[PDB]
């Protein structure tokens, strides 16, 4: 789901 991707990214940037 294209609309989810930005979550994948915000979780990484936060992660590290």
């Amino acid at each position, epitope marked *: *789901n*294209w*609309f*989810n*991707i*930005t*979550n994948x*990214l*915000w979780l990484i*940037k*936060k992660k590290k």
Partner: antibody
Amino acid sequence: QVQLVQSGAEVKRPGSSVTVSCKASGGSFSTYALSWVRQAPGRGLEWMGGVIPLLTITNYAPRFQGRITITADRSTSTAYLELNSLRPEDTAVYYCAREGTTGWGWLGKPIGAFAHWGQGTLVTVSS
Amino acid sequence: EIVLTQSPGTQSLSPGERATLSCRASQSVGNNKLAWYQQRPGQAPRLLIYGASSRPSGVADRFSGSGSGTDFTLTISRLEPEDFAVYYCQQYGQSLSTFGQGTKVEVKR
């Protein structure tokens, strides 16, 4: 803030190609989804596609595919909707929409839905 | 393609009253990714609800969204003058997002 500012109205011709721009200012640009949503004269909203500026991850709608391109200019925090093979039917108001983030306290965490909008751009396609 | 069916076409009722707008999808909307927008006459859409239940901050308590799977409902509890506008439902549970044809909330006289 997070302000989206679109280009002035346009009068193109059947067969022509139009390019509309959207300027984001007051929030992160490269990491949030940016979609374009038009509205024909006296009708509802139609979602055309989007793009995640980072890797230029594009999502096009079948009805438009192979006829539309959506771009991001990270160095200028701007988005571009280009649409060719313009027909009078495409006469509509084109909107720039940026998704919202959890708790405006502030920018951080995507939610999919479009919390931010441009003022809209009138594109008229007639001969 | 998922079709969002909004009804009634036009719901006409007095201010201070409660409005319940219906949105039914032709398929199951995954993760309840459903949003309700309010478009006032000469303006742009204003996001009211997302994730079916979730309300942004800035949106007044009047607005509440419920339902799931394939049946969603927007609810204004006590209509204010500004609430008489058009309302659209959008699904983003899959890549190809779609809107409902919209519903007008008119003042009844």
